[PDB]
Symmetry: D2
Subunit: 387 residues, 4 copies
């Protein structure tokens, strides 16, 4: 029951099941995994592919010979399993050199280094077949108001992304970029804090068509925002290139719980939206098995991630197909929301006495929207109290 | 000391000092104010101008006869005091007909009425000399996930704003639009919930140059966001058409405290940015004198808005003029942040061995950023523990 | 399926289904209900009883003759339906006289008036058979730091509750008090903001055994706190006299959604706790049908409140009875949490080399807690993906 | 200007200026500090004393031989500088053995070890002259609902603290305990999450007079609570045994900024309360110099903690001494709040017709509270826009 298959396109970062459990207040509770181990075990669970930071795969400061050895083992594991690498990213946050940022560090030499580190991993990503390159600017921001002129920092952020777009275009690489927003942590405030800010920023890049967003469930919820709404605006703008799935319990530190945990009803509405929009990208889990767990718990957590997606997919499909939900959607006038307000145009609207001079505002006010019946039908379907 | 003059461009909504004190749990504590008396009292306190919703000035339902008398009185009061009207807006949220929204109501006849109500007041705003027309879509949104398909709602929101742009251009009006974001309240989630979401949406309008943002301090802080950072991004994009100043204590109901209250250091950094950037628009206060106050308390709170801006302006100017602060900014490499990362171009960066192959990452990592010393100088200046 | 019966002890305030839809930004969307109407319609839906503020039932400023008439109609409705009145409360928040509080208003004459208004409604509550008297201090607090000396206000709050306890004891009334915490709204901060603060305060009253708490789901969640955890501490202290059930989407304005909405997994764990602890009080819904709804939506929302409790009760019972959940609870050592740490006493512990000198800290660290398997079993049961 | 002296009783944890900068996403940016060098550098800056976790002073695993050398060195450094040790505490959160808690671990052998580790350090704290022993149960809590039965966990927490009280009383030690609350991080939810929850729990201990709270500014603000109000309730209950001063920007990860940063007006009102109440305990800073800083930045940030306290103390004293402020407090009836509501007793209140039957509710409602004028005087004093 609810068995994932590679066709469900479930992917996992090496750093997810690989998280050793170090948090701001405690040491690691688990040994490091070999990336070859993670590839083989995820394949056995039904995953479609894996993702990585350069530093997950290639120890920082590896010689070129050592780099080749690390990639070759990972290679062979992918070939043996049929696992894909649909996305890759750069670690510009762990090493102390990035303590004030990568692309927006105040020091210019750090900013040049960050671009060279990124470009080097784009080459590797393309070699392994990645279609999407993710950027999470986790150190781009500030704790204090004077440390960062945000207009200058946005200039520097635009400069970095324009240069990366020039690089892939000149190389002829078939790869697109996705910006992963986060409002805060580890910096007091992070630049481009939400999906909305990242979408706005993309429109000022030199080749906007190369860039989209990689929203993460828990990050939008860390600002108290509605994640399905934000995904809808990304889809509306044609910019949902990738998605990070996990769980989060409201406004606090970034929990990265397994998908389904945290806000369960938001997860239901998210899956409803992704499936009915026909989103065809990877369903990527950016999550951390809690550090209370041993390795059996790590694999149980990863499996629960895909199981919960599949359960919610079934309930949302059953919800949309229910004849009673049907009628309720017509009763709440969802079909009328999808029709133009004024396809007759401005002059016709201005000359329409039914729209103002003769509009019965009190009769219109008295109409119930019947949203509560509709929502309890959705609740019933989520809980399996009807089919 | 710290006396406002109309050269300071402080403006106030009629609905601010006129708020009668009704909240979700209580009845009014103050009598309604005659719009003409508010104009005179604000002029006596040093204000530059006033703003209004249609329904603040003209009682809803007013005959075309009565409407004319109300405007004539108001225009006369303006002439007598001088007072400007730099901005106006539409009430699309109080009347029960708007309970599911104005521009994005599921019912099409409500959406057409909302547009007709807005266009009528655009004509009046232009007659009164308003340069900016604000839209706060307070009822656009949802309490439950199935009640609103957000892609269709954004289509309807775009349709509405495109029609408004066609109206003002066809009339030859020289007025611009400013979208006021808010994340929630009175709806469970409001569409376009932050500055970033509104900036992204503007780029998909037919004539984006006609539209900018009217951010409010307390609204971005209701999502835990850094209001000065969001202002900087609006300035960077060329879209800060107007601003709403008030105070808010973190993530809760929308408090609308007088400016200075709430988050005092964020207020300091906001004023630093506005004055440093040379923002020349109105300094508008969207605030509510607490309902504990009588009418003397109303005017004290309004005066406090302007006084707090003026104190912060002084401290931020002293901060930026301080030779010691200028040296601390250089020590933190803020001047290097204003440096192009790679004005030499992609190929030159790729060939620069000092940016990667020969970069001493450990020496760069050892550099302190000196941010804490800079921030304590900023604290000393704000508190007047130096000059 | 999932039909409520009076035996489920579901109760509703008159002000819940009676809410006319006025919010901080909009007028009422629904007409007032006659309390007789609400009693009869709730009985038909399967409710056990109703609750009321004095001002819900008796128009403020009613003469004693008018008061008698209003109670008699309500009376007869209760007799006709078999509906009980298990709890009553005082409105000390709506009238402008309470704008700085009731029990902790700065003005002493308001504080005396608030006590007299309260005592008068205790008499009526006892006459109608109420066992619990609730106090929600919604106006007790401040917007600014100097307006309220909190030590003096707590003295005044203790004084008020001590006098009420004296009154009921002298009268011989069989009634207990329950304090309903809320962190904020309509005041910027409210005194006794959480369950924990109210429990602490009760221990300083003259007769603590007379007082307990009435926690509300959405209020604890407005502080980002775990509601099941807070209920567990109230049960642990023997102080859970009453409970308010509803839904809330994280940290924002008080939504009062129907129970089940908001945080669905917290609702599951709350019902699990209440049922397995054998809580035998009323399951009271303090909720507001959204103002988008007509009266059909009002009754659908109220019905959904009880339906969702009954669904979650079934899933939590099935969860606890599942032999596989059994074994998983033993695997996570929940049974070991229930055993004393040191029933051998302090000296035996100090002399136990296995507890320190010879404790294998690394072997103990390596034990997985198996919490993720346990939690996915709970998820499966909630979603009906097993039985 | 604003120079600290040891008479100001500023203290610092070894782990504060010694924080190496490791966070969940990054490695250390600073080398470890020798405890002796921290003691000397803090003494040079004007500090009164230092505090420590067992594992800050003695490396975990140290032989009984090595342990003695470490304390001898530290004691000598204390003697040389003078420096006090007013408080000590146990690290029950870093080692992986504590991944499910110390006192409330599900595994009983871990709970016994946690107690033995604590008792060993209580002996050392007493040898060094500590008067307060702090417990922050950072790992007590849960990520998921089924992992912890909270009633059993509170039984185990009470058992632990009762054993500690029996130990110190049996030894004749003159040390008291202070529970440090935190709502979340590193656990999804932490038990006893706020000041109020901890105060309530203390009343159920065997010897409650031995236990109080050690509240931290940023921890109560992580739940959106008003830290000065929570301090007032602790003072009211006689339980403020110690305090942790730092800064926090609202509801997010625990920032531990230097005192003054974060919420500046809350800092002002806290200092006003502490000094007005005559709190004579340590002014302790639980802060982390941001990891952007080198060692010069570490000491600048530490100096900034003490400087900001001293500036606020000056402004709060000027505020309270101002005859104009004293008149504004009378105008807002703060002196009436200090009035018994009904010192004449229950019967007299019931017979007082002026308190109900003849109370003019409309006249009382018309009284303004003059809070905004009072609050602007407080703003002027904080900013030094008057003296
Ligand atoms: Mg992510
Ligand atoms: Mg506004
Ligand atoms: Mg309630
Ligand atoms: Mg602390
Ligand atoms: Mn995350
Ligand atoms: Mn607002
Ligand atoms: Mn509520
Ligand atoms: Mn902290």
């Amino acid at each position: 029951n609810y068995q994932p298959t590679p066709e469900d396109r479930f992917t996992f970062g090496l750093w997810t099941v690989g998280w050793q459990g170090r948090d701001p207040f405690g040491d690691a509770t688990r040994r490091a995994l070999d990336p070859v181990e993670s590839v083989r075990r995820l394949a056995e669970l039904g995953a479609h592919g894996v993702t990585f930071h350069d530093d997950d795969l290639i120890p920082f400061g590896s010689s070129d010979s050592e780099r080749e050895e690390h990639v070759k083992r990972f290679r062979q594991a992918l070939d043996d399993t049929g696992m894909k690498v649909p996305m890759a990213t750069t670690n510009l946050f762990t090493h102390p050199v990035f303590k004030d940022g990568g692309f927006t560090a105040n020091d210019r030499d750090v900013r040049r280094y960050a671009l060279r580190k990124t470009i080097r991993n784009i080459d590797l990503a393309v070699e392994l077949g990645a279609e999407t390159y993710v950027a999470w600017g986790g150190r781009e921001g500030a704790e204090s108001g004077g440390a960062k002129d945000v207009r200058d920092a946005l200039d520097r952020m635009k400069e970095a992304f324009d240069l990366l777009g020039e690089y892939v275009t000149s190389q002829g690489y078939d790869i697109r970029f996705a910006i992963e927003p986060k409002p805060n942590e580890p910096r007091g405030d992070i630049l481009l804090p939400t999906v909305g800010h990242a979408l706005a920023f993309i429109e000022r890049l030199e080749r906007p068509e190369l860039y989209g967003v990689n929203p993460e469930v828990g990050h939008e919820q860390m600002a108290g925002l509605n994640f399905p709404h934000g995904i809808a605006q990304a889809l509306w703008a044609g910019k949902l290139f990738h998605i990070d799935l996990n769980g989060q319990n409201g406004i606090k530190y970034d929990q990265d719980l397994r998908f389904g945990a945290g806000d369960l009803r938001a997860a239901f509405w998210l899956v409803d939206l992704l499936e009915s929009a026909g989103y065809s990208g990877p369903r990527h889990f950016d999550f951390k098995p809690p550090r209370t767990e041993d390795f059996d718990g790590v694999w149980a957590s990863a499996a629960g991630c895909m199981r919960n997606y599949l359960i919610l997919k079934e309930r949302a499909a059953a919800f949309r197909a229910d004849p009673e939900v049907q009628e309720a959607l017509r009763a709440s006038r969802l079909d009328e929301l999808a029709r133009p307000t004024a396809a007759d145009g401005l002059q016709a609207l201005l000359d329409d006495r039914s729209a103002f001079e003769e509009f019965d505002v009190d009769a219109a006010a008295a109409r119930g929207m019947a949203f509560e019946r509709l929502d309890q039908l959705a609740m019933d379907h989520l809980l399996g109290a009807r089919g």
